[PDB]
Amino acid sequence: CPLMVKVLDAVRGSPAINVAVHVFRKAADDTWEPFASGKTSESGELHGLTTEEEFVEGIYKVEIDTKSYWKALGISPFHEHAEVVFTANDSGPRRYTIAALLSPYSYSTTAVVTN
Amino acid sequence: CPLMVKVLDAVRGSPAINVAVHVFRKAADDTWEPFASGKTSESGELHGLTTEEEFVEGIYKVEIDTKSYWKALGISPFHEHAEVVFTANDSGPRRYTIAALLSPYSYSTTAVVTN
Amino acid sequence: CPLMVKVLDAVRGSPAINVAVHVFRKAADDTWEPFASGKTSESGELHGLTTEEEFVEGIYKVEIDTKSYWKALGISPFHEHAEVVFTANDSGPRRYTIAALLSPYSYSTTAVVTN
Amino acid sequence: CPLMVKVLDAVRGSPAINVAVHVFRKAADDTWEPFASGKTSESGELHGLTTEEEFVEGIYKVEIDTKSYWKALGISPFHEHAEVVFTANDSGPRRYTIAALLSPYSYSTTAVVTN
Ligand SMILES: O=C(O)c1cc(Cl)c2oc3ccccc3c(=O)c2c1
Numbered sequence: 001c002p003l004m005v006k007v008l009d010a011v012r013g014s015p016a017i018n019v020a021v022h023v024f025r026k027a028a029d030d031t032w033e034p035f036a037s038g039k040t041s042e043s044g045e046l047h048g049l050t051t052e053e054e055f056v057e058g059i060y061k062v063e064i065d066t067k068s069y070w071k072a073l074g075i076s077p078f079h080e081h082a083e084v085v086f087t088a089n090d091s092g093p094r095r096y097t098i099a100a101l102l103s104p105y106s107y108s109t110t111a112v113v114t115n
Numbered sequence: 116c117p118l119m120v121k122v123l124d125a126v127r128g129s130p131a132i133n134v135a136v137h138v139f140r141k142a143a144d145d146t147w148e149p150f151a152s153g154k155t156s157e158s159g160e161l162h163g164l165t166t167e168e169e170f171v172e173g174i175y176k177v178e179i180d181t182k183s184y185w186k187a188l189g190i191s192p193f194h195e196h197a198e199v200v201f202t203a204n205d206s207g208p209r210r211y212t213i214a215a216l217l218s219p220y221s222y223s224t225t226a227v228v229t230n
Numbered sequence: 231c232p233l234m235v236k237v238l239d240a241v242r243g244s245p246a247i248n249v250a251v252h253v254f255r256k257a258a259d260d261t262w263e264p265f266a267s268g269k270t271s272e273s274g275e276l277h278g279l280t281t282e283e284e285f286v287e288g289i290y291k292v293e294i295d296t297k298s299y300w301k302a303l304g305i306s307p308f309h310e311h312a313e314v315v316f317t318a319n320d321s322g323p324r325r326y327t328i329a330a331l332l333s334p335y336s337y338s339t340t341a342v343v344t345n
Numbered sequence: 346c347p348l349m350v351k352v353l354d355a356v357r358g359s360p361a362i363n364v365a366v367h368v369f370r371k372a373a374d375d376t377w378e379p380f381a382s383g384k385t386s387e388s389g390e391l392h393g394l395t396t397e398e399e400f401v402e403g404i405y406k407v408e409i410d411t412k413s414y415w416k417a418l419g420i421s422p423f424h425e426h427a428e429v430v431f432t433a434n435d436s437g438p439r440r441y442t443i444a445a446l447l448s449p450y451s452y453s454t455t456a457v458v459t460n
């Protein structure tokens with residue numbers, strides 16, 4: 001699988017478990033078409049979103065549903081979601097790990113890209 | 116003005132100057148409609164985006180054109196842009212500062228909400 | 231003043247107020263000697279730590295007492311403190327802002343160096 | 346091994362390889378005694394620093410030699426090192442992953458603590 005998502009909780013110092021993640025791909029008409037979705041495991045990782053065949057060149061949006069995560073823990077956070085938008089595979093296939101570090105009023109997102 | 120945006124450059128250790136910023140408000144049909152925009156100043160700040168009367172409760176998206184910023188510096192970026200999506204909530208008097216700290220393959224964003 | 235420290239709270243989305251900050255300069259015997267200190271203001275900022283004449287080239291450590299900050303808010307922290315160690319270098323006129331963004335199990339720090 | 350260190354490069358979107366890491370433990374006389382050291386692998390991870398028997402309660406300092414890393418890549422960075430100071434094992438043994446995300450003028454550090 002060439003796209004993995006990892007989410008961490010900076011309040012608890014733990015993986016962020018059961019975080020919903022939706023991936024979209026920009027269509028020819030410039031709309032966001034649904035591409036894949038899943039939820040993080042007990043390790044905070046989401047594997048198996050897509051395949052080498054399906055994950056073609058394009059502009060992708062990874063929406064990490066941070067508000068739903070915080071609300072399930074009884075917390076009212078600031079952001080609706082974390083949104084990571086990037087062009088993928090423009091110079092051939094790559095493997096992408098998208099990591100997000102979450103706090104109620106702040107997040108960071110980082111990409112590790114390997115060949 | 117109840118909404119300010121501040122952008123910093125983690126590679127050069129400087130304000131991120133002349134970065135385009137677009138603010139959208141979510142419409143009833145779930146589309147994003149333009150709300151305010153500008154370019155960051157020499158201090159990395161964008162003031163005067165909106166007024167108290169215009170900035171009603173709702174869902175807002177702040178899109179920071181990070182790819183064009185890095186390209187103007189000759190540095191290869193990952194993201195198309197940085198997105199910050201949040202709900203404005205009238206809980207007494209409030210001023211929102213949206214800060215973004217930019218690196219080529221990572222960004223962080225924080226909200227500082229003060230009375 | 232050539233050195234300012236700014237501290238933000240990523241859990242509450244606020245300046246980090248009344249945080250103790252200690253600055254040390256590395257002495258010839260590799261020990262850290264006290265140089266300046268204070269507490270952050272209601273804006274999360276600590277101004278007036280030093281003067282142009284006092285702030286010579288050398289290695290400095292900024293220690294931010296994050297554990298006491300979180301304890302005063304009733305929140306369980308990981309770190310004893312946040313440390314920022316850097317060399318001051320006379321490359322033309324320079325002002326240093328050391329910013330720290332605090333969460334219970336994570337912090338980030340950035341230097342904004344301006345002319 | 347109950348202490349692992351992971352380092353990422355936010356400029357390249359890659360593991361930070363060959364980063365030196367020194368761990369110290371506060372001694373009874375309040376000095377930092379050397380505890381363990383190593384270097385990150387091609388994955389950006391440093392395993393095998395210590396053992397369950399050796400990693401007793403205490404206050405530990407993890408120094409990540411970021412300046413040497415950037416200088417080996419031909420870059421002049423701001424910080425001397427990243428310094429992570431924490432009390433370990435106070436409520437019994439835990440496993441600690443310390444992650445650092447590096448840019449030339451900024452870094453973040455996060456702890457994931459598991460039982
Ligand atoms: O007001 C400033 O001068 C200033 C300077 C720095 Cl380095 C800053 O770094 C930051 C790093 C992460 C998140 C927010 C900030 C800031 O809001 C910030 C503000």
Ligand SMILES: O=C(O)c1cc(Cl)c2oc3ccccc3c(=O)c2c1
Pocket residue numbers: 006008099100101108110351353442443444445446453455456457
């Ligand atoms: O693989 C891990 O166990 C692990 C642990 C921690 Cl704390 C991590 O913190 C991070 C903080 C910012 C950006 C990325 C990461 C990570 O990718 C990360 C990975």
Ligand SMILES: [Ca+2]
Pocket residue numbers: 057089090091092
């Ligand atoms: Ca292509």
Ligand SMILES: [Ca+2]
Pocket residue numbers: 172204205
């Ligand atoms: Ca309301």
Ligand SMILES: [Ca+2]
Pocket residue numbers: 287319320
């Ligand atoms: Ca010099």
Ligand SMILES: [Ca+2]
Pocket residue numbers: 402434435436437
């Ligand atoms: Ca104990």
